[model samples]
Target: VGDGTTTAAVLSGELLSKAEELIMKGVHSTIISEGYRHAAEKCREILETITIAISPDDEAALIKIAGTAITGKGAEAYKEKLSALTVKAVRSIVEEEEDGLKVNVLENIKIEKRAGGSIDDSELIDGLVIDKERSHPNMPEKVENAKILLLSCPVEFKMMREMAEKVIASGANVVFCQKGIDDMAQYYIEKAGIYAVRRVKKSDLKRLSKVTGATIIQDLDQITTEDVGTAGLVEEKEVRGGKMTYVTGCQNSKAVTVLLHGGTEHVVDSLDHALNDALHVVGVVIEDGKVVVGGGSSEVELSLRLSEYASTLKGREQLAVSKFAEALEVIPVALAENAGLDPIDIMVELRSQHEKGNKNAGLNVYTGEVVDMWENDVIEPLRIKTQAINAAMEATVMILRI
Candidate 1:
């Protein structure tokens, strides 16, 4: 669970009992959105419920139970699933070969690695497998069945997809996706039915590619000692609102590299930090959708509460409507906070829901409804998103054949 992969660890099964509890609570429809604070809260809550159910005497259960009491509507079903998800989560955690890790690199460089199963501590092989850049002739066979892959540069999505297609066609399951889930690729992903782990970074990209029999291409050129400091300075700078975002589409593990063209170094730097935070946050709750509610105007959570409290609504459709609105609220609140605006105020000002209006509900920055965000504003956190989209598209396209 290292390497800044808190969210990834959560997805490994921490929420199973919570999910089951929620399902039992009759919160049948669900969504899993990403971002750290939210994802962390979610995983913690679900895992806690599970832990308590599985290990009733533990102190950790109380921590989550306390939080759930404060934030969520106390529901019988939610509690029931909490325990179920725990067993599911723990099993998954035990099954994983190694915990994920992260590195902050600036200048591209090569570091030597030890031989397979050899005695080298800093050999760069831990829960990961690397396939040298094609430029590196006579590279090792990239340790088979690796969960992560290391790459020197970016590749096209078609190429990756091609490799993925064969993997699925050969009856391998697609669990994560680098390209993400869309009408175009969902068919293949579902057919293969394994986690795809799409839109990956250096470590994660290697993991997903290695899992699917794909080779990794990592640049070996190392930065000199002098260059290292400069690279560190450059890498340390944060993007104004830029951050990393993990996409768990089609159950595929993938990496999305966002190259932002910021107007000022400061702005770019701020974004880089923001996006990095965002990406890490995203890794936590990629599997399920979320809802955030607070506003003078009718809020998603309010609607749900109202429906549940109101004696006039008991129909299945009405219940569905309540859940639908709840899902839209989480990201709006997130976007508002990213722009330094109060989520309550922004939610109040959010455009009234219209049946005929564009329903781009999950992410609301582009519509300009959340705080000061605009459709074409390609800066801040949006820059990270732009980069991620490109990375996902390109990666999917690059592997369509192999």
Candidate 2:
């Protein structure tokens, strides 16, 4: 889905871009990279301090987290309905740990979509779709499916059939391809009771890749079980006018997939990213539920604090730390740009707000005004932000070497 990667990308050059002026002022890129390392570690600790904890026991707060992520990505009407479901869908599969039972974001939730049911009496269910009815009709009805892998090799009946052994050895059943699945190979796996959906449409495969992250298998035998992914149950049963194989639920892997009741690549994909993020936050809440304020409130606050932290450092290292502070604003700036709102003044306003110790103050493009992130119910999983920080640092070091 939408991983907010732009935040990482924009920041990727922040320090390096900030370095040009500093390096000419006699600081080196290595020092900047070195300082980023400290900044990142320091940022991690600081983030920990600023975070507010959400107990898994709080359903309403989970709703707010889901809403925060779902906003701006879909219909305003659907936002409420959608927010409600993302919470339920995630809670349905999430385990409560000690007090009772259930625990796993393994292959969390995903949406199987086609742009039709869009809210107005729309067909139901999020990731676990029982409406998954399309497949070769020749195969016997009713079978279990999960842990599938993408197929890429050209069909060579015998050699391909020969390749089936290692794949089966991995204990994952379903496999499908883009090019071809020769009768021999198809029959070979079918006889072995493996499901092979041949010559799937490119777009279908493309989006499936977006959800699966299941790497394409160049040579069937070359892959291990590691190439397979989660699918809780793909049992062939009846669902309305279709023989539904409910691709619902999963076990053992952190990856999850979702589908929606609609038609259109944009709607399906756009919703998918939103849901994924929602489930991630919802899932995070059910598990740990810790989050930072959203709407760039956290970003601005961190930027301000980092500068003060920067002040304590001596020498050019302090310069990198301060530059790191400037880069932190990218999240809010990008947030402003993505929301299609004016940001330069917004940025200055945020700085002033934080300067006045209104740390909870945040941007609300929805209102065309600044507001308290918490009061506005704007929050995000701490994981994504921290992960972005980690990613930017690693990339900084990675590019520093190149």
Candidate 3:
């Protein structure tokens, strides 16, 4: 979803208020509720009028959608850069299907944050990064064309390698274990010119093995060359005064990690939230392939159409229908206020253009004038507007029943 939730909620609240007023004046509650139902349908119809098509391959539009999401958030300072990064990260792991693109953010993208550097310093890594460091300081800090072993226990490297000749034959130069590494085993592993890390979380083990095409082994007796995972590079690097594991250059990896850095804990946390919001908005746009002009254009058009629709209704229900139209203007009103513009003047200009059949006319907050939001690149996913309207309308109907 995008930024239309608040606008939907406000419209629903006003609808209820207006309905209550009519009820107090002796209009039947059922009639008012029915009128509101009809108005919701009309609102959805008006929404369709303002929607713009979004192609799945439209990267520029997708970035703008993401920029809109992070506009007022902590990431606003770098929305251009952040938006591009967000799109690239999401698209890398997206799966194309007959129907549409399927994205599993949890499986495809991992977020890792560490404090010390500015948010601008945060960047996406092509592979996974584990917070755990090397098992022993004496272990090689870097290995190229690594063959990784995923293990449950840290048996003596020499004895295990002897037991499974295939492991030595496989040339697995790195070991990642779920249990602690014995001091002797660490020394022997280093002596063999292999890098090793121990006491890794079980979940990390699964992820690492999966990405590297390595098999997890509980017993060294059953190890084979086929069980080894491959990585172009596995290294331990110092970051923020602490050494961390970096697994990079994975072949056909379905998952990637985003390593976020910030100067303070709060800044890191803020960035985490902002990045997630941007990702979600981009994901929905790709999946839905539909967008609508934002900056109150959709709202103004909705208000205009609904007013015309109310005229065709005969009875007290028309009053409720007309109020529904008026309620739609709340979005434009708030937009102008937030941008430090005069709401009355903006509304007058918006109505003037809308009356002349300019459906896309909306407040240009930067200039305090009514203009087409599409031309300004103010757009949002259609799913947000539709979901918001249906949810709000359902809430209004439920409240009227009480």
lDDT of 1 by residue, 125-216 (tens): 11222222211112121222323222334222354565435334433222222333333343454444333333444554444343234444
How many clashes would you count in candidate 1?
124
Best by lDDT: 3
Residue 149, candidate 3: Cα error in Å is 7.8
Whose TM-score is greatest here? 3
What are the per-residue Cα lDDT tens digits for candidate 2 across 290-377? Answer: 6888788887888899999999999989988999889889878877877888889889899999899887788986786888888888
What C-alpha lDDT values do all the predictions have?
Answer: 0.30, 0.68, 0.79
Per residue, candidate 3 scores C-alpha lDDT tens digits across 1-402 of 435678678778878888788889988888887887888888777776666666656888878877776756446566787787778888877788898777667666778888767666877888889889887788788999989999876555455445434334457888888987667656667677878888898988978877899999888668888888898899998776688899999755878888877778887777677778888878777777677777777778888888888899899989888877887888889899999888998888888887787766777778887788877767677778878877777889898887
Q: Which residue runs does candidate 1 get wrong by more than 4 Å?
A: 1-254, 263-266, 277-293, 296-402
Cα misplacement distance, residue 28 of candidate 3 (Å): 3.2
Candidate 3 has a TM-score of 0.69
Consecutive 10-residue window with the lowest summed lDDT within model 1: 227-236
Better of 1 and 3 by lDDT: 3
- Quick one: ranking by lDDT, best first? 3, 2, 1
Mind sharing the TM-score for model 1? 0.20
Provide the TM-score for each candidate, comma-separated: 0.20, 0.59, 0.69
